[PDB]
Amino acid sequence: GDLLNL
Amino acid sequence: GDLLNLDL
Amino acid sequence: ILPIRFQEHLQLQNLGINPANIGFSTLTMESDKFICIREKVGEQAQVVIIDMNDPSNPIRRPISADSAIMNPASKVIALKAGKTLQIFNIEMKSKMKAHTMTDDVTFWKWISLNTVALVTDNAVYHWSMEGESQPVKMFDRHSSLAGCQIINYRTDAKQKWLLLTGISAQQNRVVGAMQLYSVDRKVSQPIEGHAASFAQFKMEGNAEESTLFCFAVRGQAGGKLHIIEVGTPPTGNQPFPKKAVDVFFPPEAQNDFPVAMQISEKHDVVFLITKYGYIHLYDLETGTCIYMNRISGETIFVTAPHEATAGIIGVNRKGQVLSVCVEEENIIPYITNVLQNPDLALRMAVRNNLAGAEEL
Protein backbone atom coordinates (compact mmCIF):
# COMPACT_ATOMS: atom_id res chain seq x y z
CA GLY A 1 0.00 0.00 0.00
CA ASP A 2 1.02 3.59 -0.64
CA LEU A 3 1.55 4.62 2.99
CA LEU A 4 1.98 1.32 4.83
CA ASN A 5 2.99 -2.25 3.99
CA LEU A 6 0.91 -4.51 6.28
CA GLY B 1 -30.01 33.09 17.32
CA ASP B 2 -28.00 31.34 20.01
CA LEU B 3 -27.83 27.52 20.25
CA LEU B 4 -27.36 27.83 23.99
CA ASN B 5 -29.49 29.94 26.37
CA LEU B 6 -26.95 31.50 28.71
CA ASP B 7 -27.91 32.13 32.32
CA LEU B 8 -28.39 36.00 32.20
CA ILE C 1 -3.64 -10.51 42.24
CA LEU C 2 -4.48 -8.92 38.90
CA PRO C 3 -2.34 -6.68 36.71
CA ILE C 4 -5.14 -4.05 36.44
CA ARG C 5 -7.44 -2.18 38.85
CA PHE C 6 -11.18 -1.57 38.06
CA GLN C 7 -13.04 1.34 39.68
CA GLU C 8 -16.64 2.70 39.57
CA HIS C 9 -16.77 6.51 39.64
CA LEU C 10 -20.48 7.37 39.22
CA GLN C 11 -23.94 6.07 38.35
CA LEU C 12 -25.56 8.67 36.06
CA GLN C 13 -29.13 7.53 36.85
CA ASN C 14 -28.53 8.58 40.44
CA LEU C 15 -28.09 12.18 39.17
CA GLY C 16 -31.58 12.19 37.51
CA ILE C 17 -30.48 11.22 33.98
CA ASN C 18 -33.08 9.47 31.90
CA PRO C 19 -31.68 6.06 30.77
CA ALA C 20 -33.05 6.67 27.22
CA ASN C 21 -30.51 9.55 26.89
CA ILE C 22 -27.49 7.44 27.81
CA GLY C 23 -26.07 6.58 24.38
CA PHE C 24 -23.77 7.53 21.53
CA SER C 25 -25.90 10.26 19.91
CA THR C 26 -26.82 12.11 23.16
CA LEU C 27 -23.91 11.67 25.70
CA THR C 28 -20.38 12.94 25.05
CA MET C 29 -17.18 12.52 27.05
CA GLU C 30 -14.33 14.34 25.26
CA SER C 31 -11.96 13.99 28.26
CA ASP C 32 -12.20 12.79 31.86
CA LYS C 33 -13.17 16.31 33.13
CA PHE C 34 -16.80 16.56 31.85
CA ILE C 35 -19.78 14.55 30.65
CA CYS C 36 -22.48 16.31 28.50
CA ILE C 37 -26.01 14.88 27.97
CA ARG C 38 -28.76 16.24 25.68
CA GLU C 39 -32.29 15.58 27.10
CA LYS C 40 -35.77 16.74 25.96
CA VAL C 41 -38.12 17.60 28.83
CA GLY C 42 -41.60 18.66 27.70
CA GLU C 43 -41.13 20.59 24.45
CA GLN C 44 -37.77 22.06 25.70
CA ALA C 45 -34.40 20.59 24.73
CA GLN C 46 -31.69 20.91 27.43
CA VAL C 47 -27.98 20.16 27.96
CA VAL C 48 -26.83 18.70 31.30
CA ILE C 49 -23.16 19.43 32.08
CA ILE C 50 -21.54 17.21 34.70
CA ASP C 51 -18.26 18.49 36.26
CA MET C 52 -16.40 15.28 37.18
CA ASN C 53 -14.70 17.07 40.07
CA ASP C 54 -18.10 18.10 41.54
CA PRO C 55 -20.62 15.72 40.02
CA SER C 56 -23.56 16.18 42.43
CA ASN C 57 -24.14 19.77 41.19
CA PRO C 58 -24.79 19.61 37.41
CA ILE C 59 -25.77 22.62 35.34
CA ARG C 60 -28.88 22.25 33.10
CA ARG C 61 -29.43 24.84 30.31
CA PRO C 62 -31.86 25.22 27.36
CA ILE C 63 -30.48 24.47 23.88
CA SER C 64 -31.54 24.22 20.26
CA ALA C 65 -28.67 22.00 19.06
CA ASP C 66 -28.29 18.51 17.57
CA SER C 67 -24.89 17.89 19.27
CA ALA C 68 -22.84 19.32 22.26
CA ILE C 69 -19.10 18.64 22.98
CA MET C 70 -17.13 20.18 25.85
CA ASN C 71 -13.50 21.21 25.52
CA PRO C 72 -11.02 18.70 27.06
CA ALA C 73 -9.71 21.10 29.73
CA SER C 74 -11.94 24.23 30.07
CA LYS C 75 -15.70 25.05 30.45
CA VAL C 76 -15.94 26.00 26.74
CA ILE C 77 -18.70 24.16 24.85
CA ALA C 78 -19.20 23.67 21.11
CA LEU C 79 -22.81 23.29 19.76
CA LYS C 80 -24.13 22.58 16.27
CA ALA C 81 -27.43 22.54 14.37
CA GLY C 82 -27.02 21.19 10.82
CA LYS C 83 -24.44 23.46 9.17
CA THR C 84 -24.42 26.08 12.03
CA LEU C 85 -21.53 25.91 14.54
CA GLN C 86 -21.24 28.05 17.74
CA ILE C 87 -18.70 28.06 20.59
CA PHE C 88 -19.43 29.45 24.13
CA ASN C 89 -17.28 30.20 27.15
CA ILE C 90 -19.65 29.27 30.05
CA GLU C 91 -17.80 31.08 32.88
CA MET C 92 -17.59 34.31 30.77
CA LYS C 93 -21.25 33.89 29.61
CA SER C 94 -20.20 34.70 26.11
CA LYS C 95 -20.37 33.66 22.48
CA MET C 96 -16.79 33.33 21.32
CA LYS C 97 -17.18 32.02 17.71
CA ALA C 98 -19.80 31.26 15.03
CA HIS C 99 -19.40 29.62 11.57
CA THR C 100 -21.80 28.23 8.94
CA MET C 101 -20.46 25.33 6.83
CA THR C 102 -21.42 24.49 3.20
CA ASP C 103 -22.40 20.90 4.13
CA ASP C 104 -23.99 19.39 7.30
CA VAL C 105 -21.43 18.33 9.90
CA THR C 106 -22.28 14.65 10.64
CA PHE C 107 -19.58 13.95 13.28
CA TRP C 108 -17.22 16.16 15.28
CA LYS C 109 -14.81 16.08 18.25
CA TRP C 110 -11.99 17.95 20.04
CA ILE C 111 -8.60 16.59 18.87
CA SER C 112 -6.49 18.85 21.11
CA LEU C 113 -6.87 21.56 23.78
CA ASN C 114 -7.68 24.14 21.12
CA THR C 115 -8.76 22.43 17.86
CA VAL C 116 -12.05 20.84 16.80
CA ALA C 117 -12.24 18.24 13.90
CA LEU C 118 -15.30 18.44 11.57
CA VAL C 119 -16.56 15.54 9.36
CA THR C 120 -19.12 16.06 6.58
CA ASP C 121 -20.39 13.49 4.07
CA ASN C 122 -17.54 14.62 1.69
CA ALA C 123 -14.50 15.86 3.70
CA VAL C 124 -12.62 16.46 6.98
CA TYR C 125 -11.72 19.88 8.41
CA HIS C 126 -9.72 21.20 11.40
CA TRP C 127 -10.83 24.44 13.23
CA SER C 128 -8.46 26.15 15.66
CA MET C 129 -9.84 28.42 18.38
CA GLU C 130 -6.80 30.75 18.11
CA GLY C 131 -7.23 34.29 16.79
CA GLU C 132 -9.67 34.64 13.86
CA SER C 133 -9.01 31.10 12.47
CA GLN C 134 -11.64 29.56 10.15
CA PRO C 135 -12.14 25.81 9.38
CA VAL C 136 -9.39 24.46 7.01
CA LYS C 137 -10.03 21.39 4.75
CA MET C 138 -7.54 18.57 5.57
CA PHE C 139 -8.66 15.91 3.05
CA ASP C 140 -11.50 14.50 0.91
CA ARG C 141 -13.22 11.29 2.12
CA HIS C 142 -12.45 7.97 0.42
CA SER C 143 -15.34 6.06 -1.30
CA SER C 144 -14.74 3.04 0.95
CA LEU C 145 -16.36 4.94 3.88
CA ALA C 146 -19.48 5.90 1.84
CA GLY C 147 -22.70 4.98 3.76
CA CYS C 148 -20.71 4.11 7.00
CA GLN C 149 -21.72 5.29 10.49
CA ILE C 150 -18.75 7.50 11.51
CA ILE C 151 -17.52 6.45 15.00
CA ASN C 152 -14.13 8.13 15.51
CA TYR C 153 -11.40 10.46 14.23
CA ARG C 154 -7.85 10.63 15.65
CA THR C 155 -4.39 12.11 14.90
CA ASP C 156 -0.81 11.73 16.00
CA ALA C 157 0.70 14.31 18.37
CA LYS C 158 2.05 16.48 15.51
CA GLN C 159 -1.17 16.40 13.44
CA LYS C 160 0.69 14.94 10.45
CA TRP C 161 -1.10 11.53 10.38
CA LEU C 162 -4.95 11.58 10.40
CA LEU C 163 -7.35 8.66 10.79
CA LEU C 164 -11.15 8.50 10.07
CA THR C 165 -13.17 5.37 11.12
CA GLY C 166 -16.68 4.18 10.08
CA ILE C 167 -18.70 0.93 10.40
CA SER C 168 -21.54 -0.87 8.61
CA ALA C 169 -23.19 -4.32 8.24
CA GLN C 170 -21.78 -6.62 5.50
CA GLN C 171 -22.43 -10.35 5.25
CA ASN C 172 -24.20 -10.34 8.63
CA ARG C 173 -21.18 -8.85 10.50
CA VAL C 174 -19.98 -5.42 11.60
CA VAL C 175 -17.21 -4.34 9.16
CA GLY C 176 -14.86 -1.44 9.91
CA ALA C 177 -13.46 0.89 7.28
CA MET C 178 -10.63 3.29 8.03
CA GLN C 179 -8.98 6.09 6.01
CA LEU C 180 -5.35 6.92 6.92
CA TYR C 181 -4.11 10.26 5.54
CA SER C 182 -0.53 11.69 5.42
CA VAL C 183 -0.55 15.50 5.51
CA ASP C 184 3.01 15.79 4.13
CA ARG C 185 2.44 13.29 1.24
CA LYS C 186 -1.22 14.30 0.46
CA VAL C 187 -2.06 10.57 0.03
CA SER C 188 -4.71 8.28 1.69
CA GLN C 189 -4.76 4.51 2.27
CA PRO C 190 -7.95 2.57 3.00
CA ILE C 191 -7.57 -0.05 5.75
CA GLU C 192 -9.99 -2.63 7.24
CA GLY C 193 -10.09 -1.87 10.97
CA HIS C 194 -12.40 -1.23 14.01
CA ALA C 195 -10.43 0.76 16.69
CA ALA C 196 -7.07 2.59 16.77
CA SER C 197 -4.65 5.11 18.39
CA PHE C 198 -1.33 6.77 17.61
CA ALA C 199 1.46 6.90 20.22
CA GLN C 200 4.95 8.35 20.71
CA PHE C 201 7.55 5.72 21.78
CA LYS C 202 11.35 6.20 22.28
CA MET C 203 13.16 2.95 21.41
CA GLU C 204 16.33 1.86 23.25
CA GLY C 205 19.28 3.38 21.47
CA ASN C 206 17.37 6.11 19.52
CA ALA C 207 17.74 9.88 20.09
CA GLU C 208 14.23 10.68 18.81
CA GLU C 209 10.75 9.37 19.50
CA SER C 210 9.10 7.02 17.04
CA THR C 211 5.45 7.75 15.89
CA LEU C 212 3.51 4.45 15.97
CA PHE C 213 0.03 3.59 14.60
CA CYS C 214 -1.83 0.81 16.49
CA PHE C 215 -5.12 -0.71 15.23
CA ALA C 216 -7.31 -3.70 16.07
CA VAL C 217 -9.57 -5.46 13.57
CA ARG C 218 -11.95 -8.44 13.58
CA GLY C 219 -11.62 -9.63 9.98
CA GLN C 220 -13.26 -12.53 8.10
CA ALA C 221 -10.43 -14.70 9.54
CA GLY C 222 -10.25 -13.63 13.24
CA GLY C 223 -8.93 -10.78 15.40
CA LYS C 224 -5.63 -9.00 14.91
CA LEU C 225 -3.71 -6.13 16.51
CA HIS C 226 -1.07 -4.27 14.44
CA ILE C 227 1.68 -1.93 15.74
CA ILE C 228 3.57 -0.12 12.95
CA GLU C 229 5.80 2.99 12.58
CA VAL C 230 4.32 5.61 10.25
CA GLY C 231 6.79 7.36 7.92
CA THR C 232 10.58 7.19 7.73
CA PRO C 233 12.47 7.23 10.98
CA PRO C 234 13.76 10.50 12.40
CA THR C 235 17.42 10.92 11.21
CA GLY C 236 19.88 8.58 13.08
CA ASN C 237 17.07 6.29 14.54
CA GLN C 238 16.66 2.53 14.05
CA PRO C 239 13.20 1.71 12.52
CA PHE C 240 10.63 0.21 14.93
CA PRO C 241 10.09 -3.47 14.02
CA LYS C 242 6.41 -3.95 13.12
CA LYS C 243 4.29 -6.45 15.11
CA ALA C 244 1.03 -8.26 14.28
CA VAL C 245 -0.57 -10.39 17.03
CA ASP C 246 -3.85 -12.28 17.55
CA VAL C 247 -6.84 -10.72 19.33
CA PHE C 248 -8.96 -13.53 20.94
CA PHE C 249 -12.75 -13.70 20.79
CA PRO C 250 -14.43 -16.67 22.53
CA PRO C 251 -16.61 -19.07 20.55
CA GLU C 252 -19.79 -17.68 22.12
CA ALA C 253 -19.07 -14.00 21.19
CA GLN C 254 -19.45 -14.46 17.42
CA ASN C 255 -20.73 -10.92 16.81
CA ASP C 256 -18.35 -8.98 19.14
CA PHE C 257 -15.75 -6.51 17.80
CA PRO C 258 -13.28 -3.82 19.05
CA VAL C 259 -14.83 -0.43 19.89
CA ALA C 260 -12.18 1.56 21.77
CA MET C 261 -8.44 1.88 22.27
CA GLN C 262 -6.34 3.99 24.66
CA ILE C 263 -2.50 3.81 24.94
CA SER C 264 -0.67 4.70 28.20
CA GLU C 265 2.68 6.39 27.40
CA LYS C 266 3.46 6.19 31.17
CA HIS C 267 3.52 2.35 31.11
CA ASP C 268 3.77 1.68 27.29
CA VAL C 269 0.62 -0.52 27.33
CA VAL C 270 -2.44 -0.66 25.04
CA PHE C 271 -5.97 -0.91 26.52
CA LEU C 272 -8.57 -2.47 24.11
CA ILE C 273 -12.31 -2.62 24.88
CA THR C 274 -14.92 -4.58 22.81
CA LYS C 275 -18.61 -3.71 22.12
CA TYR C 276 -19.85 -6.33 24.64
CA GLY C 277 -17.55 -5.27 27.49
CA TYR C 278 -14.33 -7.42 27.21
CA ILE C 279 -11.04 -5.65 28.23
CA HIS C 280 -7.60 -6.64 26.81
CA LEU C 281 -4.16 -5.29 27.81
CA TYR C 282 -1.11 -5.55 25.46
CA ASP C 283 2.53 -4.49 25.71
CA LEU C 284 3.15 -1.64 23.16
CA GLU C 285 6.81 -2.61 22.51
CA THR C 286 6.29 -6.34 21.69
CA GLY C 287 2.54 -6.67 21.26
CA THR C 288 2.45 -9.43 23.91
CA CYS C 289 -1.03 -9.96 25.41
CA ILE C 290 -0.80 -9.44 29.21
CA TYR C 291 -4.45 -9.89 30.30
CA MET C 292 -8.06 -10.30 29.20
CA ASN C 293 -11.49 -10.43 30.97
CA ARG C 294 -15.20 -9.42 30.71
CA ILE C 295 -15.75 -6.16 32.76
CA SER C 296 -19.19 -4.84 31.64
CA GLY C 297 -22.46 -6.61 31.05
CA GLU C 298 -23.72 -3.48 29.28
CA THR C 299 -22.14 -2.23 26.04
CA ILE C 300 -19.49 0.53 26.37
CA PHE C 301 -20.04 3.30 23.78
CA VAL C 302 -17.58 6.12 24.73
CA THR C 303 -14.10 6.29 26.34
CA ALA C 304 -11.29 8.78 27.13
CA PRO C 305 -7.85 8.75 28.66
CA HIS C 306 -7.98 8.75 32.50
CA GLU C 307 -5.34 11.36 33.39
CA ALA C 308 -4.82 10.51 37.04
CA THR C 309 -3.80 6.85 36.46
CA ALA C 310 -2.84 6.97 32.78
CA GLY C 311 -5.61 4.36 32.19
CA ILE C 312 -8.98 4.37 30.39
CA ILE C 313 -12.35 5.77 31.56
CA GLY C 314 -15.70 4.96 29.91
CA VAL C 315 -19.47 4.92 30.14
CA ASN C 316 -21.82 2.00 29.59
CA ARG C 317 -25.43 1.92 28.39
CA LYS C 318 -26.69 1.74 32.06
CA GLY C 319 -24.81 5.00 32.94
CA GLN C 320 -22.01 3.41 34.94
CA VAL C 321 -18.83 5.55 34.62
CA LEU C 322 -15.82 3.21 35.12
CA SER C 323 -12.07 3.17 34.78
CA VAL C 324 -9.28 0.56 34.34
CA CYS C 325 -5.56 1.17 34.85
CA VAL C 326 -2.32 -0.74 35.52
CA GLU C 327 -1.88 -1.92 39.10
CA GLU C 328 1.74 -0.82 39.63
CA GLU C 329 2.50 -3.10 42.60
CA ASN C 330 1.11 -6.24 40.88
CA ILE C 331 1.83 -6.16 37.14
CA ILE C 332 5.49 -7.40 37.33
CA PRO C 333 4.84 -10.37 39.66
CA TYR C 334 1.74 -11.27 37.62
CA ILE C 335 3.72 -11.44 34.35
CA THR C 336 6.47 -13.47 36.05
CA ASN C 337 4.28 -16.00 37.91
CA VAL C 338 0.93 -16.25 36.10
CA LEU C 339 2.03 -15.58 32.48
CA GLN C 340 5.38 -17.27 33.16
CA ASN C 341 7.21 -14.72 31.04
CA PRO C 342 10.32 -13.53 32.91
CA ASP C 343 11.70 -11.79 29.79
CA LEU C 344 8.70 -9.44 29.54
CA ALA C 345 8.60 -8.92 33.32
CA LEU C 346 12.26 -7.89 33.46
CA ARG C 347 11.91 -5.57 30.47
CA MET C 348 8.81 -3.79 31.80
CA ALA C 349 10.34 -3.44 35.30
CA VAL C 350 13.43 -1.59 34.06
CA ARG C 351 11.74 0.25 31.12
CA ASN C 352 8.95 1.81 33.22
CA ASN C 353 10.72 1.77 36.69
CA LEU C 354 8.22 -0.66 38.25
CA ALA C 355 9.18 -2.86 41.23
CA GLY C 356 9.01 -6.66 41.40
CA ALA C 357 11.68 -8.33 39.19
CA GLU C 358 14.30 -8.56 42.04
CA GLU C 359 13.34 -12.29 42.30
CA LEU C 360 12.31 -14.13 39.07
Numbering used by the authors:
A (entry chain D): 2 to 7
B (entry chain C): 2 to 9
C (entry chain A): 4 to 363
Article, verbatim:
In all the structures presented a peptide could be observed at the “clathrin box”, lying between blades 1 and 2 of the NTD β‐propeller fold (“clathrin box”). For the cellular peptides (AP2CBMpep, AmphCBMpep and Amph4T1pep) the binding is similar to that previously described, with the 3 leucine side chains of the CBM LΦxΦ[DE] consensus sequence occupying the hydrophobic pocket formed at the groove between the 2 blades. In addition to binding at the clathrin box, we observed significant binding of the cellular peptides (AP2CBMpep, AmphCBMpep and Amph4T1pep) at the “arrestin box”, which lies between blades 4 and 5 of the NTD β‐propeller fold (“arrestin box”). While all 3 CBM peptides bind in the same general orientation at the arrestin box, the molecular details of these interactions differ from the interaction seen between NTD and the extended surface loop of the arrestin 2 long isoform (arrestin2L). Most notably, the directionality of the peptide chain is reversed. The first 2 leucine residues of each CBM (LΦxΦ[DE]) bind in a hydrophobic cavity lined by the side chains of NTD residues W164, L183, S185, R188, V190, I194, F216, I231 and V233 plus the peptide backbones of Y184 and S191. His‐NTD‐NEMO with mutations at the clathrin box was less efficiently captured by GST‐AP2CBM, the defect being most pronounced for the Q89A + F91K mutant, but capture of these mutants by GST‐AmphCBM or GST‐Amph4T1 was largely unperturbed. Similarly, His‐NTD‐NEMO mutated at the arrestin box (Q192Y) was captured less efficiently by GST‐AP2CBM but the capture of this mutant by GST‐AmphCBM or GST‐Amph4T1 was not significantly changed. While His‐NTD‐NEMO mutated at either the clathrin box (Q89A + F91K) or arrestin box (Q192Y) can still be captured by GST‐AP2CBM, combining the mutations (Q89A + F91K + Q192Y) reduces the binding to the level of the GST control. We observe that combining mutations at the arrestin and clathrin boxes completely abolishes the ability of the AP2CBM to capture NTD in GST pull‐down assays, confirming that CBM peptides bind promiscuously to both sites.
